[PDB]
């Protein structure tokens, strides 16, 4: 399922969002 990152706006699998926010911020 895809979610939008609340910061950079990229669409990505929900299972990545936490990890993404942790790495990019």
Q: Which residues contact Zn ion by CB under 5 A?
A: 5, 7-8
Q: What, of Na ion, Zn ion, a second copy, none, does residue 19 touch, CB below 5 to 8 Å by kind?
A: a second copy
CA pair distance 4, 10, nearest whole angstrom: 6
Query: Tokens at residue 19, please?
Result: 């990890």
Report whether 19 belongs to an annotated binding site: no
Q: How many residues of this chain interact with Na ion, rule: CB under 5 A?
A: 3
Shortest distance (Å) from residue 23 CB to Zn ion = 9
H/E segment holding residue 2: strand 2-4
Q: What is the token pair recorded at 5?
A: 């990152």
Q: Does 17 bind Na ion (CB under 5 A)?
A: no
């Amino acid at each position: 399922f895809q979610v939008q990152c609340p910061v950079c706006q990229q669409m990505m699998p929900a299972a990545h969002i936490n990890s993404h926010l942790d790495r990019c911020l």
